[PDB]
Amino acid sequence: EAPNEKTLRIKVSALKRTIKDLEFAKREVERELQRLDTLCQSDPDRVPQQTKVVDEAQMMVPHSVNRIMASVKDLSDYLEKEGSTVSNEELLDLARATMADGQAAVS
Known part of the structure; x- marks a missing residue:
């Protein structure tokens, strides 16, 4: 329910959709x-x-591909900013896993 947690979740879900x-x-x-x-x-x-x-x-x-990459950058930027303080370890692992899945999908 933390607003940074909520935003991170939305961005991870969005990225997952671009990969599919x-x-x-x-x-x-x-x-x-x-x-x-x-x-x-x-x-x-x-x-x-x-x-x-x-x-x-x-x-x-x-x-x-371009949409995946734009989503990866957005998530990555967020993780450096207000996402940097998210305490939910499993959501952070999931965000990193989903970025790695996007990078794998391109290349």
């Missing part, structure tokens, strides 16, 4: 590339539309 976003976005690229091939053979009048969706799917990967 990238995972689903990467899985979807592979599907869009398949969805292209399917619609290619079944219905090539849809291929132009799906070519454009595939290209956008691929660009959504760096977009998702």
Whole structure:
């Protein structure tokens, strides 16, 4: 209920969501590339539309990466400021674990 604890929790949850976003976005690229091939053979009048969706799917990967990194920096900055005094050891461990998961997810 400490306001710094509450803010830290929100930032950790936000970061976790950006990481899951990238995972689903990467899985979807592979599907869009398949969805292209399917619609290619079944219905090539849809291929132009799906070519454009595939290209956008691929660009959504760096977009998702950029969001993870912006969230990692925000959390990291907070931990140097009002987050620096949080006494909840397990929340601090979780914040550090989640940052490490984000860094792993990019790279």
